[PDB]
Design a protein around this ligand. Sequence first.
Ligand SMILES: O=c1ccn([C@@H]2O[C@H](COP(=O)(O)OP(=O)(O)O[C@H]3O[C@H](CO)[C@@H](O)[C@H](O)[C@H]3O)[C@@H](O)[C@H]2O)c(=O)[nH]1
Ligand SMILES: O=c1ccn([C@@H]2O[C@H](COP(=O)(O)OP(=O)(O)O[C@H]3O[C@H](CO)[C@@H](O)[C@H](O)[C@H]3O)[C@@H](O)[C@H]2O)c(=O)[nH]1
Ligand SMILES: [Mn+2]
Ligand SMILES: [Mn+2]
Lengths: 279, 279
Amino acid sequence: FMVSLPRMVYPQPKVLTPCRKDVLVVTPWLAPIVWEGTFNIDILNEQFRLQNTTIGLTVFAIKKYVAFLKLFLETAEKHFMVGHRVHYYVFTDQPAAVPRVTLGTGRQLSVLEVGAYSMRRMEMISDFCERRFLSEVDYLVCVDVDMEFRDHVGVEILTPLFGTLHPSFYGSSREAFTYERRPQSQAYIPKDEGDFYYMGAFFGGSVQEVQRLTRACHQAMMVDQANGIEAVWHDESHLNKYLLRHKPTKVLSPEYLWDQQLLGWPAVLRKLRFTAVPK
Amino acid sequence: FMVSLPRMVYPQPKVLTPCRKDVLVVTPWLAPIVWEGTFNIDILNEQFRLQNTTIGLTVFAIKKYVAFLKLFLETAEKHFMVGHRVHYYVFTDQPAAVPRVTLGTGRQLSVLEVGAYSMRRMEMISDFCERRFLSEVDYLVCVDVDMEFRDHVGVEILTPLFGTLHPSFYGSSREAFTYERRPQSQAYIPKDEGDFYYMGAFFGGSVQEVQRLTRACHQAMMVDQANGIEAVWHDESHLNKYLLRHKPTKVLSPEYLWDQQLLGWPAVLRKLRFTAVPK
Ligand SMILES: O=c1ccn([C@@H]2O[C@H](COP(=O)(O)OP(=O)(O)O[C@H]3O[C@H](CO)[C@@H](O)[C@H](O)[C@H]3O)[C@@H](O)[C@H]2O)c(=O)[nH]1
Ligand SMILES: O=c1ccn([C@@H]2O[C@H](COP(=O)(O)OP(=O)(O)O[C@H]3O[C@H](CO)[C@@H](O)[C@H](O)[C@H]3O)[C@@H](O)[C@H]2O)c(=O)[nH]1
Ligand SMILES: [Mn+2]
Ligand SMILES: [Mn+2]
């Protein structure tokens, strides 16, 4: 049950004025594509706070990648779901190397140890952590660690299932997408199929939908392994196959996954929110 | 659980090409605004058929308005949810005056008799028919009868909660909206609030959300009656108050509720789907 919003004063949306004329802001299956200027964060914050929403964030820091945690977490504290309940789940082979990061109120961090080792992340999120997540959070956000938050990443992303447009391919035609092209792989997508090329570095949704996605990808990856084939971009290839056949209910623009060193700051990006760190 | 979509061949959505540049296609709370050119109906039909979706349509034909049923129903057969399961619920004081309309396969019609008499419709939909609808349909669409379908009205509208932009006010600023302006009414909206002016003639959603809306509006109307006040536009005033405080998850453009005699055929309308009949 959703309680009433309070009175709010904000600019009237005008039907004969688009928010953005330079970009596609809705997919052909009526999922919003999230760009700056398409959302009033005050309305969304109200909606999600009234439901006491808890967001889980998963991040893996195995071997040398523990070095990325300090900046990742400190910048998440500045920019990720501020004002909402957040539970970080840090998966690592070196619990002692997790930096002690000071958290805002209503935010917690759990260190989950994994064995020293694509397959792990999908497997961990689905198989081992299924019951944990269902009991503890409403939404799960699953990201790469070699990243930093530079600007707002908030409840505008939340939805049953989302993927993020890969920053190198948002202007590409589908035949150029680096999907798995061998019919022998479960991740196979022919050249006349595909909506978008989604990056494996940032996906999420409700706990139920994320567990469905990660279970399906893990099962498909096991089939490929049994058949002696490894998809060209590993987990990302399977994620793309899944999101082709199970359309996401929001799509995040490349504001949410950018590499400024590689790609600069094009006119179409009003904000660079979550960005690659040198590695 | 949602099964996989089959392989489909359709045009690739292009991120740097908007579907429509002349209109707002998403609200500030990230609800799609449904216009022609924003949706691929083949994808949506697949999604909804894979769930074996059943759509209920409610229509009231009391006193002289039974005359509108023949055209309403015959044109619904041509244009409304064709290929999907449909259950019409015709509420009338004259069951014998309901025309015998030939239905396509997978479509049924129930005649519900009501006593000879705003309050009735919200009351009937919520109070009397609650259990019926929950058992029989997935979505409810609630419309006026003095109307005809001229073009496709399909599963693109389906969502937990929708309203429809009133055709006379989609270009108006909020201070001009004919909301109830007396603070003594439950339907009161001050001049600095409001997103859109929604028409009472076409709303819907999941059965649960429609029952919530109609219950809330009926309760608010009873409060007003007890206080000796009748909102300026009756049920429509209350519907507007509800949708201000409970944001719809889709908004239908005025393609879905048009009066051509009054308003012609402006450039912004590529299709006139559901239109007023002279009365
Ligand atoms: O030794 C390692 C290697 C990887 N990781 C984790 O795995 C993530 C992915 O590896 P990374 O080296 O960041 O791969 P990238 O080349 O930056 O990213 C590509 O490969 C990833 C893994 O397949 C996908 O998530 C991305 O979408 C795709 O762009 C890292 O961020 C870490 O969270 C570790 O923890 N330790
Ligand atoms: O004697 C009547 C009068 C009304 N109705 C039903 O009620 C509906 C609404 O009445 P109508 O005469 O169509 O009102 P309109 O002036 O066309 O519509 C305005 O009033 C309606 C009722 O308040 C709202 O649904 C609309 O949004 C608003 O534009 C009709 O279509 C019928 O379904 C009857 O069945 N018999
Ligand atoms: Mn990375
Ligand atoms: Mn009418």
